[PDB]
Amino acid sequence: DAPAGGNAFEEMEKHAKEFQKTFSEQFNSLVNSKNTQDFNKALKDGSDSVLQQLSAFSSSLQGAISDANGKAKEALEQARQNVEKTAEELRKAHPDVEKEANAFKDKLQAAVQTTVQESQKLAKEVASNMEETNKKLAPKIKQAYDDFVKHAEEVQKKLHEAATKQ
């Protein structure tokens, strides 16, 4: 068997998690910034950006809850807002990291590492495969899959140029 089902979408948490260690390694480059009470603000622009960027896939599951056929529309509703708040969690601030500029960057790095723990709950949830009808969530889990590798490094892209501006 193979061309019918059984592939399981658990690999989504594997490729997504592996992509979480890529941004955690770049954030270390941010430390290489200036120091005049005006070097962290730019760090919040690149970090607060990955929040709305990675928080975008969260809306990809809504398609399954927008018309799910079972008790999954709810489980898929949490992974959506649950993973959307973990990233946008620090998106509620902005003037604080630039004001204290103490350790506001770790807020995002620690917020992304969690987005991976969420893929574990949704990975085992759809892993059951005991729905036998919720095939609409199939194309809903592969949505974040591509949004995880693209958003995960979303911060490593700016963070890198953030430690050297320009």
Give the domain CATH number at 129: 1.20.120.20
Token code pair at residue 128: 């059951």
Number of domains in the chain: 1
Q: What is the 3-state secondary structure (H, E, C) of the chain?
A: CCCCCCCCCCHHHHHHHHHHHHHHHHHHHHCCCCCCCCCCHHHHHHHHHHHHHHHHHHHHHHHHHCCCCCCHHHHHHHHHHHHHHHHHHHHHCCHHHHHCCCCCHHHHHHHHHHHHHHHHHHHHHHHCCCCCCCHHHHHHHHHHHHHHHHHHHHHHHHHHHHCCCC
Residue span of the structural domain in which 50 resides: 1-166
* Residue 99 CA neighbour count, 13 Å, CB half: 4
Neighbours of 40 (CB within 10 A): 23
